[PDB]
């Protein structure tokens, strides 16, 4: 359909959002999320969207590159576990974000973590969010 009036018109309404050629952004609506990849802009690489700015949208959808999915689980996709999220983040920040440091210091990092709770409480969700947001 007319994706323009469906998504982009509310997205750029009254907001002077800077836009760079080649990037991607996510628009949430219609009980789903849509990724839009910017193709071109008049002012070289970066520009500011204005009410008088023309927005061209005609064309076939682009093919996904090596860039990761923007709908994957993150720290914002988990709720009510702030203390446990902080504990897991402080337990896994050193071995994951700074791995080679543990070849130097010689201190053994934590290895085994057991999450327990009622079924459906979100253990797999927390694990996936931690893995994705640390690049592991």
């Amino acid at each position: 359909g007319n994706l323009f009036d469906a998504y982009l018109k509310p997205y750029f309404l009254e907001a002077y959002r800077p836009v760079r050629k080649g990037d991607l952004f996510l628009v949430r609506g219609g009980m789903r999320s849509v990724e839009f990849k910017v193709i071109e802009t008049d002012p070289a690489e970066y520009c500011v969207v204005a009410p008088d700015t023309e927005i061209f949208c005609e064309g076939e959808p682009v093919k996904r590159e090596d860039e990761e999915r923007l709908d994957d689980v993150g720290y914002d996709d988990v709720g009510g576990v702030r203390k446990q999220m902080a504990q897991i983040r402080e337990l896994v920040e050193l071995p994951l974000r700074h791995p080679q440091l543990f070849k130097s210091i010689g201190v053994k990092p934590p290895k085994g973590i057991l999450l327990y709770g009622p079924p459906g409480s979100g253990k797999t969700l927390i694990a996936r969010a931690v893995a994705n947001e640390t690049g592991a």
């Binding site: 070849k103 130097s104 210091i105």
Partner: protein
Amino acid sequence: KSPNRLVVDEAINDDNSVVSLHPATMEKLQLFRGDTILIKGKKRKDTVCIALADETCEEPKIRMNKVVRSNLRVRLGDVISVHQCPDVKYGKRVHILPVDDTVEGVT
């Protein structure tokens, strides 16, 4: 069994160049407190240490730490010979290098 032949023992202080003996043990070999003493080990090894007087130790036993025993290739309770040599003099230059197996990751 000459008086300069003793049995090693584990020490309380973990200094790598300190050996504790009872004063009566040192009296038989003219050893004085704070002197420099040579010790002969096994498999043609030997070390040099300094001496401290401790009354808790006994005459047959001599107290050392793990590093000295590893250098001497001996174990706890073994028999060693202790000699004295005043030729140990102040040195001008000593060249020391670390072991590759332990310095991994630190530069």
